[PDB]
Amino acid sequence: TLRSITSPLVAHRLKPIRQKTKKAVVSILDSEEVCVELVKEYASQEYVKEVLQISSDGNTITIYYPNGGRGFPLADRPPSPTISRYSFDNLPEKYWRKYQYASRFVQLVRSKSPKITYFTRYAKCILMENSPGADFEVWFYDGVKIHKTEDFIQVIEKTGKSYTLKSESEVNSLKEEIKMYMDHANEGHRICLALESIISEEERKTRSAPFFPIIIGRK
Amino acid sequence: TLRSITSPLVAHRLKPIRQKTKKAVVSILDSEEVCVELVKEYASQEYVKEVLQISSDGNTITIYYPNGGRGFPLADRPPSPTISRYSFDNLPEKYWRKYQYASRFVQLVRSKSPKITYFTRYAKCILMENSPGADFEVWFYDGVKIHKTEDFIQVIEKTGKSYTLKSESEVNSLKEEIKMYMDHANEGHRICLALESIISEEERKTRSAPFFPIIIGRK
């Protein structure tokens, strides 16, 4: 089953981007739908063999084959439909691998799209959109960098010494100066998840324009 | 009683500013305390006769008289204390008028200090800090301006026609095109007060760095 290998992608609140690759284009549209165009070259020009349109929740997949014959020319935007409609769990295996391409893209975009920026007395924290276990960067004013992933934890020092850690396994053992930074960065993390939760809940009820991205505080 | 004429001022979250006037300096410090320096000129130079330091909540007033004799020279910052301490309700009448000077300043600063900026599909709304009945500007993307005070309501049109209204007394009667804008601006207002309320409540519990100013959304 497809659900056993990935979760449906979520493109809500992500800025539009049309990213070209050698055999394909993957796109986050204005509608927040995620589009993947399959691209083949013939006669020294590039065409579009099939299109996978995914809804903003990755539940609905629309698929069409534009026809020349046999295809449509590459453009600044995706071809108009002229069609098969699936739900995530009824998507046939031949398309899974492609969906994972779009899925894997969104996931990466999400991990770089700030969701909550928060300014403390010592640092500008940034909770990213790749929930759950979203990336979390703490850019201290004094120059120190910290970055948290679901797995590992990278630290940089003013000096620029760059290094990384496992799941807090190595946590206790560190320069207690560093102990000071990580505590404060974890304080920020608790704060940001709380803010995420309440704002999310109010957004759930409100139903109009998004409450993220969000910058909070100053200095 | 002083409380019968004004409320204690609140300087929380307001950016520092040292504003000179002809007979005085009024200042919002880094500590968020609000300082008023009384200034007199002698011998072609300016001095400082007395200083009124007010806590960030306007409850505590510290008052001193720096001595030359008879005074201290004007500076880039307020004179250091060398003193009388009052609480708002025990402040003697001779100082009320001065406190109202600082009070009236803060109030004006508050009315221009954004608290929540919120981006909709049609406009960037801005709830200001002068609570309650805080000023509320709606800057539509298409050019239209709207501004709400506790009393009156100013509208500008793309054309730049500038005009104002009483307490919605005149509300119903307007170009229904204008009816469209005001409804959406009032939608934003409901949203911003709700966000203010929940974020405020979480801030009340959290107790660390401020949750305002705050920018919310995009486009």
Binding site: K15, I17, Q19, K20, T21, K22, K23, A24, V26, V36, L38, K49, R97, K98, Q100, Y101, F105, L108, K112, S113, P114, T117, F119, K124, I126, P213, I215, R218, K219 | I215, R218
Partner: peptide, 29 residues
């Protein structure tokens, strides 16, 4: 239809986009 699972997408076109997203918090700087 040779497969796309290969495709590498994170290029400098993207880095810029990523740049853009962080630009907004770049306000007190």
């Amino acid at each position: 239809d040779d497969d796309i699972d290969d495709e590498m997408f994170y290029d400098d076109h993207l880095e810029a986009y990523f740049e853009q997203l962080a630009i907004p918090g770049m306000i007190y700087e």
